[PDB]
Amino acid sequence: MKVRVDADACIGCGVCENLCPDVFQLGDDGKAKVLQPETDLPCAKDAADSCPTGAISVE
Numbered sequence: 001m002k003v004r005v006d007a008d009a010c011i012g013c014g015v016c017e018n019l020c021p022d023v024f025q026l027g028d029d030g031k032a033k034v035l036q037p038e039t040d041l042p043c044a045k046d047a048a049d050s051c052p053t054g055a056i057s058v059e
């Protein structure tokens with residue numbers, strides 16, 4: 001799966017990191033960072049579905 005994040009939609013809540021720490025990390029600038037742009041981890045989808053602003057897209 002291709003994982004991307006739209007910085008403009010990201011509010012820096014950190015829910016994606018809570019759910020899938022190996023794929024997402026809340027950076028110091030208060031924005032999510034995608035550690036695994038291409039991943040097979042099922043949690044990437046879960047984090048996307050839980051993002052409050054839909055900033056994460058998993059294809």
Ligand code: SF4
Nearest residue numbers: 010011013014016051
């Ligand atoms: S869950 Fe969404 S809004 Fe919250 S830090 Fe992750 S990408 Fe940003």
